Structure formats: C-alpha cells, structure tokens
C-alpha cells in the first residue's frame, strides 16, 4: 500500500544557557529509525531501528553532516525571527520543521512536504505545486519573497521527488519484515458499573500497526459521536499501538450498544457487542 517518510526537527533557544537545543527524528510510516540530539555525546545521526544499522559509515557521515548544517541554520533562523517579530533576546523560542514525501503502492511520488513553525504556529509551507510558499503572516512573507527569488523550492523539490522517494523505497526493502507487515488489532470489551442505574462499556484495540484506526460506538445502529470518550492513539512501546473508546450506558441497556473497529490489517471491520 501507500507509505510515507517524515523528518521532524525542533530547535529551542535558551539565552544564557548555551546554543539552542536541536533535536531531529526520522520516521517511515509510524516507525522511527534515526535521531539526532545536539546535546548528546556522539554528535552523530544515530540509528533507532534494526533495519537501518546495516548502513555503512559513509551513510552516517552524510546524514550527520546534513543534520548538523540544518542545526546551525535553525540557530541563525532563531535570531532572524527575533528581528522579524521584535522579540527580546532573553526569551526562549521554538523553531519546528517537517519535511518528507508520500509514495504509492507502486513507489511513485504522491506528495512532498517542507514546512516551518515558529512558537507552535504556522510560518511558511511549501504548497502542493512544489514551487510556491504559503506565508502565514507578515514575517513569513519576508521569507516567501527571499525564497521565491532564490528559487529555494526547486532544490527542495528535487529532493522530494528524487532522494526522498529513493531512500523510502530503499528503507521499505531493508525493513520489509517490519515496515510492510500490518498487525490487526486485538479487541476486547470491559464492563464497569458506576451507579446502580448506569455502567461503562470500554472497547479496546491493542497491538496494531500501522497506527491509523477508527473506533466508533453505536446505539441501536446510530453513531454516538458525542457521549463517547475517545483517547488519542498511544504507543504500546513495542512498535504497536493502542486505543480505547468508552460509553456510559443505562443499566440493562448494554446489548443495544455496539463498537466498530476499522483497521488496515482487518479483512472485514469488526463489530463488538457486550
């Protein structure tokens, strides 16, 4: 099926306590495989998945060099944002960045990404045409003029349509034992009385990969939408994910409620009933 590759970087300044802290992480689908921490001792792009440790030291020299350069660029980009927003030099600010590509079931390029965020809000983002930028405020429009004059999107597109797609196909191959196997969710249901006239039904989904899943409660075939407590999908810690959905029901009316599980690894969507 379709697959994705993403890098997420974060630079947090700390005036008076040294250089800004830079952290970057790389993902294939919902599987992290590399990391870089500017405060770690190695000062190297470190591996985080088994299928990437087979890469030679030439790969690690190349990736360590590119991520170190990004770290220093975000260091001077944090100073620039201070001038743009007229902010003081004592405050701690955040510069975040995401870039990557999406490939189809065959490996063809579908979409590419290249986005910046300052202090948690959108700054600039490469549009779907891989040529123009979405400037989110007056400060980003200064950056949009600079980058569109220096044709920044052209080199960034060459990576997205080429180096990103090639590396993603190469990663999916080396780790096909993990990256390309979908684990369907193991489901169960629990029952908790809260008073003598109400009770809780909790619908569990455990040990599934990839993370995308949909849990829905129904009363007499009608979606609940509201009245349904839904938690964020959470990592189990072993590469699989968890999620549960709970509904509060009047006592004696348990069987009129159903839970519906949709997942990639399910041949048919499940329906659960107490």
């Amino acid at each position: 099926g379709s697959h994705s590759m993403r890098y997420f970087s974060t630079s947090v300044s700390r005036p008076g306590r040294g250089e800004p802290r830079f952290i970057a992480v790389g993902y294939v689908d919902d599987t992290q495989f590399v990391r870089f921490d500017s405060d770690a001792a190695s000062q190297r792009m470190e591996p985080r998945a088994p299928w990437i440790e087979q890469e030679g030291p030439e790969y690690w020299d190349e990736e360590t060099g590119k991520v170190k350069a990004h770290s220093q660029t975000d260091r001077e980009n944090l100073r620039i944002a201070l001038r743009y927003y007229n902010q003081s030099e004592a405050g701690s600010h955040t510069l975040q960045m995401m870039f990557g590509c999406d490939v189809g079931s065959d490996g063809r390029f579908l979409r590419g990404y290249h986005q910046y965020a300052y202090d948690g809000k959108d700054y600039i983002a490469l549009k779907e045409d891989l040529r123009s930028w979405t400037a989110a405020d007056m400060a980003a429009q200064i950056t949009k003029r600079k980058w569109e004059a220096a044709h920044v999107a052209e080199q960034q597109r060459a990576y997205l349509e080429g180096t990103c797609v090639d590396g993603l196909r190469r990663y999916l191959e080396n780790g096909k034992e993990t990256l390309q196997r979908t684990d369907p969710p193991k489901t169960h249901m629990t029952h908790h009385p809260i008073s003598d006239h109400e009770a809780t039904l909790r619908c569990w989904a455990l040990g599934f990969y990839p993370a995308e899943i949909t849990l829905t409660w129904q009363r007499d075939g009608e979606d609940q939408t509201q009245d349904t407590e839904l938690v964020e999908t959470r990592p189990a810690g072993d590469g699989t994910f968890q999620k549960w959905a709970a509904v509060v029901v009047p006592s004696g009316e348990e069987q009129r409620y159903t839970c519906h599980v949709q997942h990639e690894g399910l041949p048919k969507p499940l329906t659960l009933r107490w």
């Binding site: 590759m5 970057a24 590119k66 350069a69 660029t73 975000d74 910046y116 950056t143 180096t163």
Partner: peptide
C-alpha cells in the same frame, strides 16, 4: 535520507 536545510528566514 536528510535534505539540505541551509535556507535562512
């Protein structure tokens, strides 16, 4: 497969 992020704001 990291890219070249040397563009300044």
């Amino acid at each position: 497969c990291y890219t070249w992020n040397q563009m300044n704001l």
